[PDB]
């Protein structure tokens, strides 16, 4: 500290004692109001790809783990975001699009792809941020007679724009002559039936597809992953993260009666002195961990190399140990004799070298 | 089914020291805290509106400015909520706050609002709006118009959030804007994120069954918040018991 | 021919290269070196056209 190899006799304030943080405590509100993924990925009836079902998702917690464990998935391809980071990401809106297609066309549900499904039934934009999930649905959607309730659009005048749906049943006019709204040669009804049967090849078996599209807007993002309760440890110096307010301190019991709308608490000098726990509605007195001014009492290096340490303001139980009003003095022995002051300690206590003695 | 039924008259009164709210969610005890925020100035000009329906369009839409202080001495059933937005038609988003006997429904959709919107009593919203499309927000919670009693609200639209503050202060024969301090607790911080420039009060009308609606009257006070610096007194228990407006008079300026 | 590391347990240090073609565990269930549910390859190829 003194930037010299020889130290003159005296007391030098050299360092600051600190109580190191031991554990990390993160307290967040109870997980609840989970997003209804269980009503999207487990529905009694799915929808035809032409009339694909869209559910808007907002104002809820997104627990993607239930989506992960719902079924074995033929594809869980995620475009523009990794699947794992989703829980730690918060999005403004999540759109869940549900439909049934044949297995061969699952590859078509991706950005930049072409086919009957991509051009005429469901289109994803080139810059799409989201995930595509598909799983086999033979038990739910296959009948031996043939399931004729799943339809697709085979004929359309122009390609679909991204996130567009056409429900029109208008007869597709492929020829110069007007159709007149009655089926006729060169006039074909656009919606064809997916005649699913249990004995079809894997390419043609029915597959249920849910497309999750995540969008961020200027509005505050209200769909974010789970919040970890962790656990609450009191009476020790732990790094606390309470509802995004971070710090480091002991959390003692509080006698302060907060009003119901208040969450934190502040000192006269605008320093946090209290907090309300989100998990349990209790008030805790945040008190920062102990600190002290480490002062080194030493005679000249010409005479001796013994030193004594004064922890300024620190009681002796919180760190040849003597308790002074200045702080805790370690390394000097109190003598009931009184001499003149050699090295000033404070509060009437002075130190001298004879070993190092401390006296009034 | 938009019908013009409400006529409105206006007078001017004094704000006294009404309109103070908690500027944040921080517990402060036995301190003097100076904050600069959108507050209703002390002894300011507040407009008293009387809305009368007797059994032409004479109920215009009020501006919102930087936030609105609302007060009413009426019972909880006559005034049933508010409307917020810019154009108040199907082209922009709008916020509808409707209270009833059991709960409050706050809902942000693309409402095609009527010129004179009112809830008619089952309860039907066909006289409030004709259509509501592309609805993006809904929030149902316990009501804040429950049961002589002066009800005060402060609405702010700051950085995407529709901050709503409220207080229920009983009053006697004394004028509807009383003396003393009643700090407004932060009630609902709605994450809306829409543009709000105009607002209108919603009233409830009963069918007559005999002049299709029963005659009624409602009195309410509207004041406008301004960027002002206040010095609030926090007592031992964290309640704001007193405040001084720093720009009102030299004595309060010295205090601030 | 150009691949990127989509998955890794931790972030890399400056001027560090990772060429380990081991499987990544994206879920609670161990993967045991075989791909399948919630077990994905870390290196994915770019669709350059
Ligand atoms: C008061 O408002 C609530 C909320 O809008 C009404 O309760 C809903 O009534 C509808 C009837 O269309 C039900 O489908 C909902 O399930 C109810 N929701 C809740 C949360 O209860 C209530 O009916 C209204 N009461 C009156 C008298 O108008
Ligand atoms: C999912 O579907 C199966 C099929 O019957 C049902 O048994 C199960 O309860 C469903 N789970 C949920 C969470 O809906
Ligand atoms: C949160 O969870 C705790 C512990 O289960 C419970 O006591 C409390 O009522 C819950 N709700 C709130 C709002 O704290
Ligand atoms: C309030 O405003 C009106 C017109 O805006 C004005 O005539 C009236 O004098 C004002 N009130 C006071 C107390 O000045
Ligand atoms: C609003 O509604 C119209 C028709 O109801 C629709 O064309 C438009 O895309 C909608 N916009 C949004 C943002 O939902
Ligand atoms: C809010 O609406 C008003 C009235 O139409 C308009 O003048 C103003 O520009 C709008 N603000 C924004 C940010 O769009
Ligand atoms: C504050 O709380 C205490 C303890 O409940 C109570 O006795 C006192 O009346 C309250 N008000 C004031 C102004 O101290």
Residue numbers in the entry:
A (entry chain A): 302 to 620, 641 to 675, 691 to 696
B (entry chain B): 14 to 23, 27 to 71, 78 to 143, 153 to 178, 187 to 249, 256 to 301
C (entry chain C): 450 to 498
Sentences from the paper on this structure:
The XBB.1.5 variant of SARS-CoV-2 has rapidly achieved global dominance and exhibits a high growth advantage over previous variants. Preliminary reports suggest that the success of XBB.1.5 stems from mutations within its spike glycoprotein, causing immune evasion and enhanced receptor binding. In late 2022, a recombination occurred between Omicron sub-lineages BA.2.75 and BA.2.10.1 resulting in a new variant XBB.1 and its further sub-lineage XBB.1.5, the latter of which rapidly became the most dominantly sequenced lineage in the United States. We find that while the XBB.1.5 maintains a high binding affinity for human ACE2 as similar to previous variants, it has a diminished affinity for mouse ACE2, representing a departure from earlier SARS-CoV-2 variants.
Despite the measured decrease in XBB.1.5 spike–mACE2 binding affinity, we were able to solve the cryo-EM structure of the XBB.1.5 spike–mACE2 complex, with the aim to provide a structural rationale for the decreased affinity. Three-dimensional reconstructions, with both one and two mACE2 molecules bound to the XBB.1.5 spike protein, were resolved and our analysis continues here with the slightly higher resolution one mACE2 bound state—with direct parallels possible for the two mACE2 bound state. As expected, this assay recapitulated the previously reported enhanced mACE2 binding by BA.2 spike as compared to WT, while demonstrating substantially decreased - though not abolished - mACE2 binding by the XBB.1.5 spike. In sum, our functional and structural data suggest that the loss of interactions caused by the R493Q revertant mutation lessens XBB.1.5 spike–mACE2 binding affinity, yet the binding affinity is not abolished due to preserved favourable contributions from the conserved N501Y and Y505H mutations.
